[PDB]
Amino acid sequence: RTNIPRICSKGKRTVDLGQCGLLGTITGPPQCDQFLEFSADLIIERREGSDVCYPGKFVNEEALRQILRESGGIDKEAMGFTYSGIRTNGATSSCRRSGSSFYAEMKWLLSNTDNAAFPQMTKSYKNTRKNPALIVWGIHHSGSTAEQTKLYGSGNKLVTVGSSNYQQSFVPSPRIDFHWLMLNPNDTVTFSFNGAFIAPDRASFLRGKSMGIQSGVQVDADCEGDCYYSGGTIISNLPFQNIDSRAVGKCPRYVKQRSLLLATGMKNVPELFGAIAGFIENGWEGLIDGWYGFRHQNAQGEGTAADYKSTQSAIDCITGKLNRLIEKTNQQFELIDNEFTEVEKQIGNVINWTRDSITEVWSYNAELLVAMENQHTIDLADSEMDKLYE
Amino acid sequence: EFTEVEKQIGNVINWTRDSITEVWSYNAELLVAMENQHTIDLADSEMDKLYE
Amino acid sequence: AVGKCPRYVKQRSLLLATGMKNVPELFGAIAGFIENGWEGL
Amino acid sequence: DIVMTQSPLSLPVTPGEPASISCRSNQSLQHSNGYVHLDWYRQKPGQSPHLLIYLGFNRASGVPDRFSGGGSGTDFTLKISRVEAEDVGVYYCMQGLQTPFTFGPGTTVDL
Amino acid sequence: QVQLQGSGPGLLRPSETLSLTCSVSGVSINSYYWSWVRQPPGKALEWIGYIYYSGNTNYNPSLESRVTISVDRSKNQFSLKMTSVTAADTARYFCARQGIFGDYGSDYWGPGTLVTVSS
Ligand SMILES: *[C@@H]1O[C@H](CO)[C@@H](O)[C@H](O)[C@H]1NC(C)=O
Ligand SMILES: *[C@@H]1O[C@H](CO)[C@@H](O)[C@H](O)[C@H]1NC(C)=O
Ligand SMILES: *[C@@H]1O[C@H](CO)[C@@H](O)[C@H](O)[C@H]1NC(C)=O
Ligand SMILES: *[C@@H]1O[C@H](CO)[C@@H](O)[C@H](O)[C@H]1NC(C)=O
């Protein structure tokens, strides 16, 4: 139940985006200039972080965020495009960096003069490196026919892309949307645009295996960063939690229960095998032997002893059981659902229903496990009593 | 496997499959453990009855 | 796996102890007053 | 190695006339994207050349409208609407589908 | 719009190792991958081979053992080194980028580095 309300991640590489967004760090807004080409095993995206400065949204959005969590950092490979014969700078009033500044690693391809023809440049790039390439591009919806005719000229606008696994076509709707793509090695990612195309400048490449965070607390590197949640870091050997069912990382199993206590000691009666409450009526305090014991009382040599021979074997059995169960699994959960920007309602209802049923079965497994292990410990300690008696 | 599904439903499917994998693996571990204990008790109880 | 299939696990190989406890040369008095077994049985 | 064949050899063209030069390959030029990898550079004698047509049959950036070489399959033909003073040049047909990037014997166009 | 510029020895005796250099602006050998070509005296233009900005090289099968291209990433220039120079290697080396590799912007042929074998 107890959590540390800081992102305590000493010893492994960490990036605090803050105002930066993780969908930002591909695009390069003014809030991600120092995190444009980051490289770490952690991403901390905050609630206040906006991924774009110009208004707009990502199409196929949560899946792209789930890819960029699993990146290990980004190695931006400089895509070799030049765009000869057209204007490149398209800085808008919405983004502020030393005045007018657009995205650093894309380009608003705009005509040289207003109300003029847009040459139909059909760009192409090949992934020479033996790694999948994250290719991004953006489409600027005009918002009106006047802005379309002023910027990209009159007439209908048709922009298409093309790959071996992606030949899906676009049209502007008379306010920039970005659309990602997986580019295989030895494959070509051919664009074809007639204006209203935020052309990319550099290609995104994954580095390793990062596991990201969505929270609001600050970063304070002092711990080992095993498991995380939306308000800090929870690190323990305990197999179950109660704080948040959306914990991402090497995280314990969420339960509906408040706190399930495993009876790691034996049945106690203060002042199920047979005679736990039999001729040996009640437990007696004057004995120091552990979670078992053989207290002594005499008539000529009165004093308390301890039968360490079976007791230490019993403690080794209980501690081996403890190290078996408190051993946490190696499974790595990911951040499927989002708490800052909500997912689509139907898929989110499926996700909540699946997650609630998973917590039902894990809570019932935890309750039944605690119950059977309590019965196992009591029956075991009664069995060492019985074998001592015989 | 031949042609991948779209990534959101694919991640939902993989998360569901890994969760069901955890449930069945943990149930199999429990079943093996307590049925090994039940075999030990079902080996020892009638030996105790032979003894008495 | 597709069809009437076994259940997937993460473990390499789980083994169910069909036989009894072995003490070569949890219930009460297992290997107690008798010490060990003998192969001639 | 893809031998690129240029047709014809020389054009003693008269001023103001449509002039068309073709270039055939023994291998059909068609990139996976569907945009044929073929170019139409023109070398000014004793100097650095200049691309006139790119990606099979596409008007090149900063290139006069007269040049609009088309073609299809394995045989592509650069065409010019009129003949002018700057027209003089040894035209080369670049492939680009595979490596080697072969060119052409050249077309010595003159008045 | 990049600007290409070439330089190197002109009067060169045969058999020894040839030196060449070529300076560029703008792209700075940081994004697109360039290449080298060879034009024998008023003969057929040939393609020496391309070099990735990362460094991976791919020369023309015709001549491969006698040709090596310098990456030179830090400096804003890429050089060429040809071994076993011959009267056949007499040529007018051009330094450039091409359409078909992925950039669709002209070629920016660099100035001709005319070479000779003399004696
Ligand atoms: C990509 O193509 C090149 C050139 O044919 C080849 O050398 C390389 O092995 C290919 N990549 C893979 C992963 O096979
Ligand atoms: C899923 O549950 C969370 C909290 O349990 C809630 O905030 C979210 O809105 C739910 N999803 C949908 C689509 O309603
Ligand atoms: C689901 O997981 C399998 C392997 O566990 C992987 O091959 C597949 O790509 C994953 N699905 C998606 C959509 O990534
Ligand atoms: C074209 O002809 C040359 C000449 O020998 C030959 O080497 C090459 O393989 C031929 N290409 C095709 C595709 O037939």
TrEMBL record, chain B:
> Where is this chain glycosylated?
N14
Posttranslational modification: In natural infection, inactive HA is matured into HA1 and HA2 outside the cell by one or more trypsin-like, arginine-specific endoprotease secreted by the bronchial epithelial cells. One identified protease that may be involved in this process is secreted in lungs by club cells. Palmitoylated.
Q: Where in the cell is it found?
A: Host apical cell membrane; Virion membrane
> What protein family does this chain belong to?
Belongs to the influenza viruses hemagglutinin family.
Q: What function does the entry list? A: Binds to sialic acid-containing receptors on the cell surface, bringing about the attachment of the virus particle to the cell. This attachment induces virion internalization of about two third of the virus particles through clathrin-dependent endocytosis and about one third through a clathrin- and caveolin-independent pathway. Plays a major role in the determination of host range restriction and virulence. Class I viral fusion protein.
Assembly and partners are described as: Homotrimer of disulfide-linked HA1-HA2.
Q: What is this protein called?
A: Hemagglutinin
Q: Which residues of the full protein are shown?
A: 408 to 459 of 560
